[PDB]
Coordinates of C-alpha atoms and ligand atoms in Angstrom, one line a residue:
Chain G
X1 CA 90.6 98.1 110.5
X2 CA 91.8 99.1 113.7
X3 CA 93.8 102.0 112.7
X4 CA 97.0 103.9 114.6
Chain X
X1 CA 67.1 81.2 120.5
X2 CA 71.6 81.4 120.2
X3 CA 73.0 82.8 117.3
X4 CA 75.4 79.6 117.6
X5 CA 72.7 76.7 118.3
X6 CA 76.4 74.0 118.9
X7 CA 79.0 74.7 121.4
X8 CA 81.9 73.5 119.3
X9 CA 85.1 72.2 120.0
X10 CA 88.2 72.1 117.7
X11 CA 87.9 68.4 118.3
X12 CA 84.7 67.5 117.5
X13 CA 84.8 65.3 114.6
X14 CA 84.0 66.6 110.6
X15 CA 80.9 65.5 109.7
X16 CA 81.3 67.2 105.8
X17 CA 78.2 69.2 106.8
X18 CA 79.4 72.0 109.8
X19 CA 82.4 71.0 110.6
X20 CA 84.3 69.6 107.8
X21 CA 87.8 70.7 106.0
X22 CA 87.5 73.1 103.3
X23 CA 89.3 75.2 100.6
X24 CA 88.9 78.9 99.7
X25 CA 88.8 80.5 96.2
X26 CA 92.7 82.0 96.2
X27 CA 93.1 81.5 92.9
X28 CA 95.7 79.1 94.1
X29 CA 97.0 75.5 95.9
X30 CA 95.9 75.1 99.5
X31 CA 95.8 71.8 101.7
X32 CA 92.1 71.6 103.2
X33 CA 91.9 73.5 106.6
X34 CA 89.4 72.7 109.2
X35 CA 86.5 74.8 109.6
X36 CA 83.3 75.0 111.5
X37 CA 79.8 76.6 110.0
X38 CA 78.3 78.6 113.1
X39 CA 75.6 79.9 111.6
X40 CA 73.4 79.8 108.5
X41 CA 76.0 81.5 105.5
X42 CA 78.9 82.0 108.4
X43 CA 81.9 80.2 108.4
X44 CA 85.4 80.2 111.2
X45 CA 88.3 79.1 110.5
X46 CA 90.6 79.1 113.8
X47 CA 94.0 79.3 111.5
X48 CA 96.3 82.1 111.4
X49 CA 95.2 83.6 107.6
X50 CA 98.0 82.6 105.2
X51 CA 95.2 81.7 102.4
X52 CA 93.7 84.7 101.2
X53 CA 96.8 86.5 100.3
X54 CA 99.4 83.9 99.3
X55 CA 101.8 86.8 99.0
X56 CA 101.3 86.8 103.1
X57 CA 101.8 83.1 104.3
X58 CA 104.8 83.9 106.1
X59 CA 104.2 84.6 109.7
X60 CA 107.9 84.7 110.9
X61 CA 109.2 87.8 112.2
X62 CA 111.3 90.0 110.5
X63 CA 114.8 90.9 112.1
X64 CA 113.9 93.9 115.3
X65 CA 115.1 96.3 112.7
X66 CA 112.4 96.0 110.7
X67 CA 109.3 95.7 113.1
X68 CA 107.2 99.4 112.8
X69 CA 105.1 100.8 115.4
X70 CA 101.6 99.7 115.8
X71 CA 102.5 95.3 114.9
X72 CA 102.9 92.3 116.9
X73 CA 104.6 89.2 115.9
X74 CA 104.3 85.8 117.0
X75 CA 104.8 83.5 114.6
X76 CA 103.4 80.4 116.9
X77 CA 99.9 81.8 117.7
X78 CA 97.3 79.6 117.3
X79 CA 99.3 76.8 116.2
X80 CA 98.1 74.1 118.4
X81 CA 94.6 72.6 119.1
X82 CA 93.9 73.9 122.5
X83 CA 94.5 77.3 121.0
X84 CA 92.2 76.6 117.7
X85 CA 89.6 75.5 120.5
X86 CA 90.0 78.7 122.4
X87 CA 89.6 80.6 119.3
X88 CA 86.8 79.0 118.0
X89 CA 84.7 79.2 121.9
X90 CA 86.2 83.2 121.7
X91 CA 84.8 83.5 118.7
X92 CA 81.3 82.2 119.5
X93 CA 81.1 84.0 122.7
X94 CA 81.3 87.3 121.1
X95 CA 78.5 86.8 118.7
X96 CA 76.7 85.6 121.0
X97 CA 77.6 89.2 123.0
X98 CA 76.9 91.2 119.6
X99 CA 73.8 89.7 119.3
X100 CA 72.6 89.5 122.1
X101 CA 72.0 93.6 121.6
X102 CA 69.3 95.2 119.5
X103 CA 72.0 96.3 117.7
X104 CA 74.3 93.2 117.0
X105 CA 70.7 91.3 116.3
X106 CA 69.5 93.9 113.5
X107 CA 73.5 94.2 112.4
X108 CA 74.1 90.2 112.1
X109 CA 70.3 89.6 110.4
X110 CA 71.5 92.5 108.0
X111 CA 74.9 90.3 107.2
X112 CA 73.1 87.0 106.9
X113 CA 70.4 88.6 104.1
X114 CA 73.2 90.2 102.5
X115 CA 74.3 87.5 100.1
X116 CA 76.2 87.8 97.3
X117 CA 74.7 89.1 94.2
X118 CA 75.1 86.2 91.3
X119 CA 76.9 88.4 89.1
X120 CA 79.1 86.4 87.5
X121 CA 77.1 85.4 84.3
X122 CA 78.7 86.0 80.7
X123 CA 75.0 86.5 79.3
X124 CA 72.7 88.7 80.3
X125 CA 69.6 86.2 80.1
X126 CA 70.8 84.3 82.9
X127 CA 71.6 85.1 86.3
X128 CA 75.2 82.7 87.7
X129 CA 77.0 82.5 91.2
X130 CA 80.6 84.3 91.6
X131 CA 82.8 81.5 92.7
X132 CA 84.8 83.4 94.8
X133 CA 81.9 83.9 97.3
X134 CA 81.7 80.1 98.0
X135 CA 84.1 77.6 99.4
X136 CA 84.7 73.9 98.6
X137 CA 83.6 71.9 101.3
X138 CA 84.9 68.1 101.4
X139 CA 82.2 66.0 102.1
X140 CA 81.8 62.4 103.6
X141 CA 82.2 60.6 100.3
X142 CA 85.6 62.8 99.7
X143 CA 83.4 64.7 96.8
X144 CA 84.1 68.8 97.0
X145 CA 80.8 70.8 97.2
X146 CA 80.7 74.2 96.5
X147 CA 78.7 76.2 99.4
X148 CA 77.8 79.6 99.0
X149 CA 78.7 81.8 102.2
X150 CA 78.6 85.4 103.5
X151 CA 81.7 85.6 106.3
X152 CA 84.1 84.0 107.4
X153 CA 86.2 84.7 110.4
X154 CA 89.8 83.3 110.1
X155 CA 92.9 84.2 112.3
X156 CA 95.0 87.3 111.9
X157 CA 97.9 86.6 109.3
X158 CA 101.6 87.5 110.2
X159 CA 100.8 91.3 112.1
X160 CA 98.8 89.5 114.6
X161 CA 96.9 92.9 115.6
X162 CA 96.2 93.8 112.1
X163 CA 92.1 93.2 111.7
X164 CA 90.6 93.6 108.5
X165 CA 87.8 92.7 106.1
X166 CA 89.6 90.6 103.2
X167 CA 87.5 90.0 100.2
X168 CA 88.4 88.2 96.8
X169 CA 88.1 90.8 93.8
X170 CA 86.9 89.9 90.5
X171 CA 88.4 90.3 87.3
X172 CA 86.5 93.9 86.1
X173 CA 83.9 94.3 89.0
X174 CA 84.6 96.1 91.9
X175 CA 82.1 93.9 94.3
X176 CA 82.4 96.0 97.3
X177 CA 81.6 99.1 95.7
X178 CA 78.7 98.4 93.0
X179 CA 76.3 96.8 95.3
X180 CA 77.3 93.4 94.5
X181 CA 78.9 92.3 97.9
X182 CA 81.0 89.4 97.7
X183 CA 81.9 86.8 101.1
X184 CA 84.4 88.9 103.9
X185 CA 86.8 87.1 105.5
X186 CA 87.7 88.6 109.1
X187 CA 91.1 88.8 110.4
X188 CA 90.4 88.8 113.8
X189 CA 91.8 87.0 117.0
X190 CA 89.6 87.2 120.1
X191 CA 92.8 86.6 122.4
X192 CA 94.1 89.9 122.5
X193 CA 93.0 93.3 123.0
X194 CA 94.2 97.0 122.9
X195 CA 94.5 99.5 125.5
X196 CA 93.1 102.6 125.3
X197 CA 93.2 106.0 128.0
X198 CA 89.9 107.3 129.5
X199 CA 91.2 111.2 129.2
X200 CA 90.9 112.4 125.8
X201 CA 93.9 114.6 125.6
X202 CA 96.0 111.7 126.7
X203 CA 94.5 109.3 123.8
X204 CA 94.9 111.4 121.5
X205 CA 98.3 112.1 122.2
X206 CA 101.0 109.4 121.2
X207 CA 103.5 110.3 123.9
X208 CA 101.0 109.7 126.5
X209 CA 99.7 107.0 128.9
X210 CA 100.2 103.6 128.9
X211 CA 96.7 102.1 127.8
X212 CA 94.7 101.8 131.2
X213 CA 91.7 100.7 129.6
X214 CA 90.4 97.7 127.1
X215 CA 88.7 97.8 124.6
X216 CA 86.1 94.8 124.5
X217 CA 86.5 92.5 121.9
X218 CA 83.3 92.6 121.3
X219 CA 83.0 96.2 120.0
X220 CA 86.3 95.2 117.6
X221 CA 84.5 92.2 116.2
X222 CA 81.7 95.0 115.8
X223 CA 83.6 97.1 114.1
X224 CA 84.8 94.6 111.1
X225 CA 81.0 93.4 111.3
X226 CA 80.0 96.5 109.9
X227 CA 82.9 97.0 107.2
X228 CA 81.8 93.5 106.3
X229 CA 77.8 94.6 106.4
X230 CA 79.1 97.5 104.0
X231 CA 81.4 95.1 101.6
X232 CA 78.4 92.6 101.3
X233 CA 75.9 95.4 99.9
X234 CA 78.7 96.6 98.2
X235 CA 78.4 100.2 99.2
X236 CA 81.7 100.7 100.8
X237 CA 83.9 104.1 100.5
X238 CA 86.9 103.6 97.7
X239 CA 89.6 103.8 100.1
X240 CA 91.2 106.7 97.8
X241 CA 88.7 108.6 99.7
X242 CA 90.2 110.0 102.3
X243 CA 90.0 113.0 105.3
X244 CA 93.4 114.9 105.5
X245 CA 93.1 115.0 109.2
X246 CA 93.4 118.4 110.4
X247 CA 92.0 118.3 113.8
X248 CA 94.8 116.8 115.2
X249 CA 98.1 118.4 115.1
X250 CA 100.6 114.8 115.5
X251 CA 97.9 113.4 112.4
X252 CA 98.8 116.5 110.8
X253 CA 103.0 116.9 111.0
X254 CA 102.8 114.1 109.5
X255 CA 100.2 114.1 106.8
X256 CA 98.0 110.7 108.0
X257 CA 95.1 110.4 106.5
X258 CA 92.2 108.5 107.5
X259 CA 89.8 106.7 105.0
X260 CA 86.0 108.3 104.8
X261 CA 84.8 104.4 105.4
X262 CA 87.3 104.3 108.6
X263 CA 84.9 107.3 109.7
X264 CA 81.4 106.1 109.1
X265 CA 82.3 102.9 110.6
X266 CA 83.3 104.5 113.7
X267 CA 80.2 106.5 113.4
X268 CA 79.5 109.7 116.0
X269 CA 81.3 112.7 115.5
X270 CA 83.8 111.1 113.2
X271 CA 81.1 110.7 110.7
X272 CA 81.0 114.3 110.6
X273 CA 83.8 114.6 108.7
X274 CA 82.6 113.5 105.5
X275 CA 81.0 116.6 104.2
X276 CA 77.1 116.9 103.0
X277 CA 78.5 117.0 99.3
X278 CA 80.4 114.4 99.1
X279 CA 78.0 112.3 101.3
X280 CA 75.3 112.9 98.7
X281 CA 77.8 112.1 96.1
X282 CA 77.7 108.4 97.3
X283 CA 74.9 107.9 98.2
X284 CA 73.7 108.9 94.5
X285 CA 76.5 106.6 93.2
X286 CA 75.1 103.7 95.4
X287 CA 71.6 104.5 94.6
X288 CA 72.8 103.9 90.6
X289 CA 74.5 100.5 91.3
X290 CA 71.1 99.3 93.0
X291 CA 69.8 100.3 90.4
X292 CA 71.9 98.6 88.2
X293 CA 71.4 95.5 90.1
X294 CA 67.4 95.8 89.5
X295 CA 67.7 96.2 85.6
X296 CA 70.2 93.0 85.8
X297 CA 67.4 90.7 87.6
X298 CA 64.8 92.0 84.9
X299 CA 67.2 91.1 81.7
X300 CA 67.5 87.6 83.8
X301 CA 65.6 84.9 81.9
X302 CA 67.2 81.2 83.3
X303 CA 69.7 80.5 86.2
X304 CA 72.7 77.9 86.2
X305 CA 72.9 75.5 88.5
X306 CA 70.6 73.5 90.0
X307 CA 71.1 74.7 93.9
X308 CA 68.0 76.9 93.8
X309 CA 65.8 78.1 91.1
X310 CA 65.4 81.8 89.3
X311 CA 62.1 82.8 91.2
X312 CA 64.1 81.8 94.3
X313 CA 67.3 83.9 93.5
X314 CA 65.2 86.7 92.1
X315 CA 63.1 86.9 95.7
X316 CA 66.7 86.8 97.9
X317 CA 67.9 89.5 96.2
X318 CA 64.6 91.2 96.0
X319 CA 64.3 90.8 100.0
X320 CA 68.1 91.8 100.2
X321 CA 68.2 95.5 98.7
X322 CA 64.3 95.8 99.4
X323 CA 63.3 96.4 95.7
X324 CA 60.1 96.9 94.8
X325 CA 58.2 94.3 92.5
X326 CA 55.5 96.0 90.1
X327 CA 52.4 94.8 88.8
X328 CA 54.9 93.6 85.5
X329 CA 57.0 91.8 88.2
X330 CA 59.8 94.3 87.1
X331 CA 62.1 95.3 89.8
X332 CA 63.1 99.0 90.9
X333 CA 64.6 100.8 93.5
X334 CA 62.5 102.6 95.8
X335 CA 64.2 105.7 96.5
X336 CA 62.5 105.6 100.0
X337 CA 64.0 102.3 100.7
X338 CA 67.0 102.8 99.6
X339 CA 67.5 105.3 101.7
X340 CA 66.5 103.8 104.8
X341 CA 68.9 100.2 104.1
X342 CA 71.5 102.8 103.1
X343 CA 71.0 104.7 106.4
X344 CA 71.0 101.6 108.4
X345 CA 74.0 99.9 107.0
X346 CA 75.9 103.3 107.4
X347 CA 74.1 105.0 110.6
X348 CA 73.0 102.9 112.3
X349 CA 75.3 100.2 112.4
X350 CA 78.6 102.0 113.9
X351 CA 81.1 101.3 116.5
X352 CA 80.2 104.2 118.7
X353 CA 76.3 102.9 118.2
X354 CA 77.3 99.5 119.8
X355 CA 79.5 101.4 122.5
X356 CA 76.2 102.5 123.7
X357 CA 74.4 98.9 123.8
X358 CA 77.6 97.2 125.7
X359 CA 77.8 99.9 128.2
X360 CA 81.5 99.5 127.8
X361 CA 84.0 102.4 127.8
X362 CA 86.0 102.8 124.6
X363 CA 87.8 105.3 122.5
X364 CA 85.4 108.2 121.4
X365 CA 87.1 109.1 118.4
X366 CA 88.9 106.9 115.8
X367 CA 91.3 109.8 115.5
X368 CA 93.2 107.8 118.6
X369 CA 96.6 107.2 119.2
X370 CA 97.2 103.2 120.3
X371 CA 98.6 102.5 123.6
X372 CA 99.2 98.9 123.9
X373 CA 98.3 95.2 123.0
X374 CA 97.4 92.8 125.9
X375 CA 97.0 88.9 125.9
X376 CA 93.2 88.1 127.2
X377 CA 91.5 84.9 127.9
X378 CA 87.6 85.5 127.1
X379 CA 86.6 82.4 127.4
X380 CA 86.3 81.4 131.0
X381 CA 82.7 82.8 132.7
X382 CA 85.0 83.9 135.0
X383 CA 86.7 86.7 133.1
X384 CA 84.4 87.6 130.7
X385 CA 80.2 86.8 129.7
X386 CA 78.1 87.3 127.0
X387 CA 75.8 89.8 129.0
X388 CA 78.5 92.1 130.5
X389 CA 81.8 91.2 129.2
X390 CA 84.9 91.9 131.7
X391 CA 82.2 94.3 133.7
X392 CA 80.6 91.1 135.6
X393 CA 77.9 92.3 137.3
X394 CA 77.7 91.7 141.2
X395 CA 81.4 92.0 141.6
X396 CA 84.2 94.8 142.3
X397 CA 84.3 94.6 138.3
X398 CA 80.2 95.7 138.0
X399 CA 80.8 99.2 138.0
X400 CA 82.9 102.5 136.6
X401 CA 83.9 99.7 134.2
X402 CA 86.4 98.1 136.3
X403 CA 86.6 95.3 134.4
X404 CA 88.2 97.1 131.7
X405 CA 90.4 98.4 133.9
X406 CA 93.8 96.6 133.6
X407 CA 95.4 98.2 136.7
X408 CA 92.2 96.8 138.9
X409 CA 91.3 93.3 136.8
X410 CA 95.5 93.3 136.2
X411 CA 94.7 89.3 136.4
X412 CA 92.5 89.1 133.2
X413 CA 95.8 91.5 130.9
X414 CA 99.5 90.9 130.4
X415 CA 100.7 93.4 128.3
X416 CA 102.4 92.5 125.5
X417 CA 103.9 95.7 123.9
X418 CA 103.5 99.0 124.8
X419 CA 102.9 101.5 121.7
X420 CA 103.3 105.2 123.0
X421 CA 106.0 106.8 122.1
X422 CA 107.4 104.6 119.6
X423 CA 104.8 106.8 116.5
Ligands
ZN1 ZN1 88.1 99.7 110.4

C-alpha cells in the first residue's frame, strides 16, 4: 500500500 | 529473453490456454472475466476489482461529502476495451522495466518459485492444493480447469488510487503469516501516478507543495511486488504491528501509525524503525513456521490429484524455502538458509533498493505526505520505455530526471486532484  | 514472450492485446481472441475467461475463488457468484496469463504462474486481469471483495463491487462515488483525503473516484475507468488494452500493454511494460534490473529479475524469479504451499489436506499423510490459490479457467470445450497461480494483477476497485496486495484467507490458517503463501492479487492501475516534492521538508509536510515530481510506476508496481514476494512465503508483519510514528510531528498530533511491513517494504532508513528485538522476534517466529512446513512434507505419504506427483510437489517446495534433504530424505531448515531467503525477501527486495536500479527520483522516506494524483499514458515509446522510463535518454528529459518533472514534461501529466492541505 501506497500510504498517506 | 522478455519476461512477457506475447505482446497482447485485449482483443486477441481466448484460446482457453493464455487468454481465456476465468473465475476467482470469492467464495461467491461471478460472470467469467477475461484474462491474459503473462507469464508462467502470473495472471492480469484489466477490470476494475469488484471480485475479491464482494462487499466492494460498487465503484460509484459517494455524494462530495463523503470523499476523504488521499481517494480518487471515477466510476468509468477502465470500462471500455481501448482502456482494458492500455492496461494490459501498461502492465506488461512495467515488468518488463522491473525486470529488466538485477533487482526486478532476482525479485520476479523469487515470486514465480514462491508457490503456494498445498496446505489444505484434512490428513496428515497426504499433501492437497488450497483452492483459493487457483482460478477456474474455461477452456475450449466450455469445461472449467482449475490452474494453480501465484499473482495476479487486476484493476484498482472503487478508490482508484488505493493499491494493495489482496489475498483470499482460509478458514484457521493465516497463509501470509505461517509460511504458507497463498496467490496475491494486485490492485494496481498503471494509468496514473502520484506526485511527490524533491525537498524533504516540503514532503514531509502536508501543507506544502503541489507534487512536482512522479513517481514511476514502475517503483509502485515494485512496491506491491515485494508485499506480494512476502505474502507468498508467508512471512509478512501482522498488520497489528505497528510504529507509533514519532519522528514526525503532523504523524504525531494525530496518532498515525504506520505498519512494521509498510517499513520493510520501503526498506532504507525506514527499516530502522523496527527495533533489533522485535526484528529477531520474527524472524524466530518465521524460522518456526518453515519449520513447520518441513515436518508437514515428512508426515506426507500420497498427494491428491493427478496434476503432478508427490516427489514433484515435495522438490517445488523443497527448492522454494531452500530446505535441506538428508541422507533419510527428511527435510529441515537450514538455519543458514533461512536466513539468507529471509534476508532477501526482506532486505534486499525494497522500494528504496529498486530506487537505486531505475535511477529515478522518488520519495526517500514512506513517512511522506501525498501531493497529488496525475493521469499518465505509459504506453507510447514516446512518453515512457522499458530502459529509462519518463527519463528518455538523448532528450531534454535524459537528465536531473526531467522526465519526472511535471512542470518540464507538463505534456506526459494532467493532474487530477491535488492532496496538500486537504490531511
Ligand atoms: Zn505498501
Amino acid at each position: 500500500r501506497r500510504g498517506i | 529473453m522478455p519476461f512477457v514472450n506475447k505482446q497482447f492485446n485485449y482483443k486477441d481472441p481466448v484460446n482457453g490456454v493464455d487468454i481465456a475467461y476465468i473465475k476467482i475463488p470469492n467464495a461467491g457468484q461471478m460472470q467469467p472475466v477475461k484474462a491474459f496469463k503473462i507469464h508462467n504462474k502470473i495472471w492480469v486481469i484489466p477490470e476494475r476489482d469488484t471480485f475479491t471483495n464482494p462487499e466492494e463491487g460498487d465503484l460509484n462515488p459517494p455524494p462530495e461529502a463523503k470523499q476523504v483525503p488521499v481517494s480518487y473516484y471515477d466510476s468509468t475507468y477502465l470500462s471500455t476495451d481501448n482502456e482494458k488494452d492500455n492496461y494490459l500493454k501498461g502492465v506488461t511494460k512495467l515488468f518488463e522495466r522491473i525486470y529488466s534490473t538485477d533487482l526486478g529479475r532476482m525479485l520476479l524469479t523469487s515470486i514465480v518459485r514462491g508457490i503456494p504451499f498445498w496446505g489444505g489436506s484434512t490428513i496428515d499423510t497426504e499433501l492437497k492444493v488450497i483452492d483459493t490459490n487457483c482460478i477456474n479457467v474455461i477452456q475450449p470445450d466450455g469445461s472449467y480447469r482449475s490452474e494453480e497461480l501465484n499473482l495476479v494483477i487486476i484493476g484498482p476497485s472503487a478508490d482508484i488510487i488505493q493499491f494493495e496486495c489482496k489475498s483470499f484467507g482460509h478458514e484457521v490458517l493465516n497463509l501470509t503469516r505461517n509460511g504458507y503463501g497463498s496467490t496475491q492479487y494486485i490492485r494496481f492501475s498503471p494509468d496514473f501516478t502520484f506526485g511527490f516534492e524533491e525537498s524533504l521538508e516540503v514532503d514531509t509536510n502536508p501543507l506544502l507543495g503541489a507534487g512536482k515530481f512522479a513517481t514511476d510506476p514502475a517503483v509502485t508496481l515494485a512496491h506491491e511486488l515485494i508485499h506480494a514476494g512476502h505474502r507468498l512465503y508467508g512471512i509478512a508483519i501482522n498488520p497489528n504491528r505497528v510504529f507509533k510514528v514519532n519522528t514526525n510531528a503532523y504523524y504525531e498530533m494525530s496518532g498515525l501509525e504506520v505498519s512494521f511491513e509498510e517499513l520493510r517494504t520501503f526498506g532504507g532508513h525506514d527499516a530502522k524503525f523496527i527495533d533489533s528485538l522485535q526484528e529477531n522476534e520474527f524472524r524466530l517466529y518465521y524460522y518456526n513456521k518453515f519449520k513447520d512446513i518441513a515436518s508437514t512434507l515428512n508426515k506426507a505419504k500420497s498427494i491428491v490429484g493427478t496434476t503432478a506427483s508427490l516427489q514433484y510437489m515435495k522438490n517445488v517446495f523443497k527448492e522454494k524455502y531452500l530446505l535441506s534433504e538428508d541422507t533419510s530424505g527428511k527435510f529441515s531448515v537450514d538455519k543458514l538458509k533461512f536466513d539468507k531467503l529471509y534476508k532477501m525477501l526482506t532486505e534486499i527486495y525494497t522500494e528504496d533498493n529498486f530506487v537505486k536500479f531505475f535511477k529515478v527520483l522518488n520519495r526517500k522516506t514512506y513517512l511522506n505526505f501525498d501531493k497529488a494524483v496525475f493521469k499518465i499514458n505509459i504506453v507510447p515509446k514516446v512518453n515512457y520505455t522499458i530502459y529509462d522510463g519518463f527519463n528518455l535518454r538523448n532528450t531534454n528529459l535524459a537528465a536531473n530526471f526531467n522526465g519526472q518533472n511535471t512542470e518540464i514534461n507538463n505534456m506526459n501529466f494532467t493532474k487530477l486532484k491535488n492532496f496538500t492541505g486537504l490531511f
